[PDB]
UniProtKB/Swiss-Prot annotation, chain B:
<feature type="binding site" description="axial binding residue">
    <location>
        <position position="1"/>
    </location>
    <ligand>
        <name>chlorophyll a B3</name>
    </ligand>
</feature>
<feature type="binding site">
    <location>
        <position position="9"/>
    </location>
    <ligand>
        <name>chlorophyll a B3</name>
    </ligand>
</feature>
<comment type="similarity">
    <text>Belongs to the PsaA/PsaB family.</text>
</comment>
<comment type="subunit">
    <text>The PsaA/B heterodimer binds the P700 chlorophyll special pair and subsequent electron acceptors. PSI consists of a core antenna complex that captures photons, and an electron transfer chain that converts photonic excitation into a charge separation. The eukaryotic PSI reaction center is composed of at least 11 subunits.</text>
</comment>
<comment type="function">
    <text>PsaA and PsaB bind P700, the primary electron donor of photosystem I (PSI), as well as the electron acceptors A0, A1 and FX. PSI is a plastocyanin-ferredoxin oxidoreductase, converting photonic excitation into a charge separation, which transfers an electron from the donor P700 chlorophyll pair to the spectroscopically characterized acceptors A0, A1, FX, FA and FB in turn. Oxidized P700 is reduced on the lumenal side of the thylakoid membrane by plastocyanin.</text>
</comment>
<feature type="binding site">
    <location>
        <position position="10"/>
    </location>
    <ligand>
        <name>phylloquinone</name>
    </ligand>
</feature>
<protein>
    <recommendedName>
        <fullName>Photosystem I P700 chlorophyll a apoprotein A2</fullName>
    </recommendedName>
</protein>
UniProtKB/Swiss-Prot annotation, chain C:
<feature type="transmembrane region" description="Helical; Name=XI">
    <location>
        <begin position="716"/>
        <end position="736"/>
    </location>
</feature>
<dbReference type="GO" id="GO:0009535">
    <property type="term" value="C:chloroplast thylakoid membrane"/>
</dbReference>
<dbReference type="GO" id="GO:0009522">
    <property type="term" value="C:photosystem I"/>
</dbReference>
<keyword id="KW-0411">Iron-sulfur</keyword>
<feature type="transmembrane region" description="Helical; Name=X">
    <location>
        <begin position="656"/>
        <end position="678"/>
    </location>
</feature>
<feature type="transmembrane region" description="Helical; Name=VI">
    <location>
        <begin position="377"/>
        <end position="403"/>
    </location>
</feature>
<keyword id="KW-0813">Transport</keyword>
Curated annotation (Swiss-Prot), chain D:
<comment type="function">
    <text>May help in the organization of the PsaE and PsaF subunits.</text>
</comment>
<dbReference type="GO" id="GO:0015979">
    <property type="term" value="P:photosynthesis"/>
</dbReference>
<keyword id="KW-1133">Transmembrane helix</keyword>
<comment type="similarity">
    <text>Belongs to the PsaJ family.</text>
</comment>
<dbReference type="Pfam" id="PF01701">
    <property type="entry name" value="PSI_PsaJ"/>
</dbReference>
<keyword id="KW-0793">Thylakoid</keyword>
<dbReference type="GO" id="GO:0009522">
    <property type="term" value="C:photosystem I"/>
</dbReference>
Amino acid sequence: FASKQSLSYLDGTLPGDYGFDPLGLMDPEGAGGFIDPQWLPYAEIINGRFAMLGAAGAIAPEVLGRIGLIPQETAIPWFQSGVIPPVGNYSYWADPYTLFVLEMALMGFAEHRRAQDYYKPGSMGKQYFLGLEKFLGGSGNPAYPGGPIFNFLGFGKNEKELQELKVKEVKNGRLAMMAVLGYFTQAIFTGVGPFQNLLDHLADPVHNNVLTN
Amino acid sequence: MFLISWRGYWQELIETLAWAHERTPLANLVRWKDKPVALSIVQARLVGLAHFSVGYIFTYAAFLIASTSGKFG
Amino acid sequence: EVKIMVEKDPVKTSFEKWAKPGHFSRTLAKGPNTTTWIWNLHADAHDFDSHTNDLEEISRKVFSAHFGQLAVIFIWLSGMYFHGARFSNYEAWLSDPTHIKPSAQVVWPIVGQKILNGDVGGGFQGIQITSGFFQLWRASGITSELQLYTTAIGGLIFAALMLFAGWFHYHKAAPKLAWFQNVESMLNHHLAGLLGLGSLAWAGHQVHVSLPINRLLDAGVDPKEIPLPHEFILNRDLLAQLYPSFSKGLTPFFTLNWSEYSDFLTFRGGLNPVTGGLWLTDTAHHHLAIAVLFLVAGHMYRTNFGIGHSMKEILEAHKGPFTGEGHKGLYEILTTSWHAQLAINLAMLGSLTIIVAHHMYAMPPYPYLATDYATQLSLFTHHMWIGGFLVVGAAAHAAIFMVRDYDPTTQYNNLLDRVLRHRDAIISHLNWVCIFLGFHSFGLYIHNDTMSALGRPQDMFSDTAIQLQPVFAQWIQNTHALAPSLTAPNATASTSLTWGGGDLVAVGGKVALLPIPLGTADFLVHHIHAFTIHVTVLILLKGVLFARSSRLIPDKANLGFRFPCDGPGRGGTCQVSAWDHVFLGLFWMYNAISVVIFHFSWKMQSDVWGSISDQGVVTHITGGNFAQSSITINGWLRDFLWAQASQVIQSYGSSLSAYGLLFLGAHFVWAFSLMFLFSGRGYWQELIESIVWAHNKLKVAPAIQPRALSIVQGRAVGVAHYLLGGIATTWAFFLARIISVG
Amino acid sequence: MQDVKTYLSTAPVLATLWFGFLAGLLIEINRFFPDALVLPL
Amino acid sequence: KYQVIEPLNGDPFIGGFETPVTSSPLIAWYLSNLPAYRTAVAPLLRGVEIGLAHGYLLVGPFVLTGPLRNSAVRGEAGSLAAAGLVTILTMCLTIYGIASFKEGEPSKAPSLTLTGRQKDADKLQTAEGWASFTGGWFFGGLSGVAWAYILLYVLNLPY
Amino acid sequence: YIGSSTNLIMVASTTLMLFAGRFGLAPSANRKSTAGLKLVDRDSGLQTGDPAGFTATDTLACGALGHVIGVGIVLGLKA
Ligand code: CLA
Ligand code: CLA
Ligand SMILES: CC1=C(/C=C/C(C)=C/C=C/C(C)=C/C=C/C=C(C)/C=C/C=C(C)/C=C/C2=C(C)CCCC2(C)C)C(C)(C)CCC1
Ligand code: SF4
């Protein structure tokens, strides 16, 4: 509840309203462009979602290959697999560039619909989507689409537990953002995956912490 | 000099030169009779044309005499 | 306090204001009755503070115009890089930089101009460039045309980006006046962010890629066998082969034991003995120091985080006895007027350009730069002209501010008021010192000319007759020559070779630099420089001070900044505004800079450059005839103009033909300027009537009545043509001389 | 689209389009019929 | 010492200032005690003093740097040139006195002091006053040139 | 290395310089200076946790200044 004063906009409403803004990037006085108070929470939400989805996959191969489950194709470093050619790359069933354009073609559909639901809330439920026209209407906030598909189990029924789930999600997203930043950084001063860094820190911290390079 | 720059600059210069002459000791015992003013407009054009013409005549008379008489054809 | 301020979508982007040509100003938005509408349209097309009156729209327009200018500069840079990539003999130049003339432009064969593609070497045919881009790319570590192509594309991207921003911040998200006024945070971010982080990033690039590649280029290896600039990033061992200090990792920097970085972070004067340029191991250290300097200097001014200075308590605190109420009321001047900022910025940027032009020739920072004489002369002349233009612009904008932004109801703060209240003294003393300098500088030349004409050279002011040795410059030279032993114990050598100390350095024949002597011929020309600079300051300062009122016209500020004259009365009041003082000062700036560049050209060709042979014998280009022949105007006529002008005139039928053509073209333009500079509007307006008569006689009378150019546009056209002709003549002469004989 | 045509109907734009087309024409003629001093007709 | 700049005589509507250069005790004393500003003394004596000073100082730039500065007539040519300059200046002073002064006008000189005391104007701004000034200046200049030459190129004590 | 003199100055300088954001000493966020070095403003806006004096910004400034001084002293003990 500290490290800043709740000036005029961080009253306590949003999930994770710890009243932290020493610069004033949500201040509603000058809000046009991309830093209005309606785009910043959404951006934090989905950046945290992607960080939560990436900070697990960055370690998953390296930690699974230690259990001997996966064959020896799991690159112990998260970066020796395609994503950066010059430091090592793995050969998949296609060129990394045709994989890239296929990924962009599959993601354009996934992202333009979401953008149109943000800019036009009720839309994306009117135009006949090819094949099974699915009910993907903008059921409320553009960051919580609800729906019978984006909520398989309906976890969260009324306001209390739903708000608790939301604040848990934003906190885990911030943690995962910091985790992937740590991945990126300590992949440079060490030269090896993060799980190996944790193991070598568990070995002996007196001679293996950050103050050794 | 007399054809490009015009009077309103030189008069505003003389007006402070006269001040500087008046407000100095040991040199305000002397005194001008005719008030110093900048040359007139047509007078400036005339002086400029006279300079242009004298220079034009002289720098070519000198050249035509030196380049020829120095070789005599 | 300090925050982001934006007004969402203040102007709808459309084409409506685009179809109506005159739209910004309502006085000429109606339509072109006469033909003096087409002219003033372009005249006040950029007069943002004249169309409207609120500082907010003016500031937004200024911002977007800056973005457009940046986009144009990015297009220019990407074009230069693409030309260096596609139509340049760069790779061939890299294999032999001492026998291959740079060239990055080719000409289509259409009408016989094919001969402009001269034989520059390396199997190439094209115009020989003098921009110095090849040396810059060699110093950057660029070693392949590919590495150019990419960056070209890069530039293009930024161009588009800039354009986008330029649109965005005017049409979608434009700030409001209260945002631009935060000068404290603006200076904080330009010091710490733009200059500090920029210098740090360039020091990083240097220390990582530019040092090993250039060192391997100095060791004589093929530019194709040199590893790529990333093999030194992902292999600290391949880089430590040259500078083994890298083997110690990033530990010395963090334990303050970084005195072991003396391999690549050096402090050594002089030039590299094989490239004739500075040590890149020295420029890396320089940039590393400058970066932290600007970074710690970017924390001075107060933001919304409690600490820091405020540039209003700093100003008011300086208020002495002699100077009234001190610097009070100047923070209100430089945050509510765009002109009082443009004046200071233009003055400082022009002076800085002059400093750059003086430093670069004396301490060549790029490899094989001091060897190529054409590049080293063009980089001096161009920058000198740029600075000379910028200072006059500063004067003009200070005059504009004084004319239509100054007001006394708040300027009772006796600093600007006090200097305004003794202008009749300031200008009088400046006039006296200008006269004194003019006499005691030019009369000496006239004395020398008359004596050498009267067969009595013993009465001249030469170095054999009565001497005028500049003792202070000689003492400064001798002091800097001994600095690395007493006043700079860690620097291995003096900062430059132009100081009397040191010795000569060769780059394979032609000489790079050597100690420069200073005799009477230098005393005279330095005093002439001082005199011309003083006269220019006289004109510009007189205009600026008398921009508001004078004894002749007490209400000149009502007339405005730009107006021809207040009648033929009071004897005559032609050319009485500040615009006319800028018009008059442009010519003296031209005179001064032309004298400076002539000085530099002759002195360098006479006492610096040349081609040394074995056993040490060095013969300069002209033969050291500057100390003796530059003391008389006749010497500047024959030994400099007549002698050195013998290359351009007879360049017909050669690869240097365009210079010979542009010589006469610029002469024609200069002489054409005199028609506008000497004549007046009335004669031409009358003559036009007798042509309109012939037109009416045949029913071809235009509806836009042909009026003649205004009294101010005539002067503008005259000075523009004059400057173009003069500078282009000197351009052609200098290039056609130095390309052939250098 | 109408205002775009009006803008393209301005004096500088029509001038530069006309002069560029004429320059292209003359340049092509001189690249195909070079060194013409006397009319061979 | 608070604020050293002041308008002339405390009147803001005159063209100048009382800066430390113009108005100051030492400067006002040094400037009042000069012969051209001593009012009551007869013009002839002031002219004699001024001519003496000027003719004595003028021998320098004529002898050291002349056309005959490298001959046995080194000092004599410079002294003659100085005498020529002082007689030319005497002629200019004479024609100025004729053109600027009448033989009936009382005085063009100021009459008041710095505090408005009704003093008497300087007799130098009369026609006969300027004539006496010119004669005394002629004599003083000739005598000063002669004395300078005597001290330099007849006796000891080089410089 | 923690026991060496090279590290003994960077800690001392940073602590002594940090003894101004809490106790009335060298200027910080909540205390401004004056042309006479009066050190009497006692006005700001910033949320801290303790009674008064030390905030979240002035700590960084005190640390940076102490680090500049400590680096200067460590590199000045080379002559
Ligand atoms: C930072 C640089 C800078 C900036 C932003 C400005 C900005 C401005 N200046 Mg300014 N100025 C500058 C530098 C700058 N100037 C310099 C360096 C000088 C000294 C020469 C001047 C001298 C100057 C004067 C004398 C005047 C201005 C005026 C103005 C204002 C209107 C300008 C306008 O509409 O021009 C529109 C632009 C044109 C009409 C273009 C004219 C074409 C030029 C002269 C020829 C270019 C030749 C080219 C290089 C090559 C020729 C060959 C090729 C064409 C074939 C505007 C605020 C005017 C004003 O009233 O201010 C309020 C005004 O009267 N300026
Ligand atoms: C070659 C041409 C030329 C010359 C000689 C001058 C000379 C001068 N200009 Mg100038 N000017 C010119 C062209 C020229 N201008 C042009 C083309 C322009 C248009 C842009 C201007 C615009 C301009 C401006 C805007 C200003 C000047 C100023 C000045 C004066 C500067 C003071 C000085 O140095 O005195 C030195 C004088 C000389 C070196 C002249 C030669 C004197 C000789 C050596 C002495 C002869 C000995 C003896 C007297 C001869 C007696 C003869 C008798 C026996 C018959 C000076 C009189 C400035 C001014 O008024 O400042 C006072 C000023 O503000 N001019
Ligand atoms: C009371 C308290 C406490 C204690 C305290 C402490 C412990 C603190 C810490 C803090 C600190 C201890 C701080 C520090 C800081 C630091 C800083 C902030 C740094 C900075 C840096 C910089 C700035 C750098 C830069 C540089 C470089 C890089 C090089 C060159 C030079 C220089 C140096 C400039 C605790 C928390 C426990 C708890 C609560 C209460
Ligand atoms: S310029 Fe126009 S105004 Fe000034 S004098 Fe000549 S005519 Fe009269």
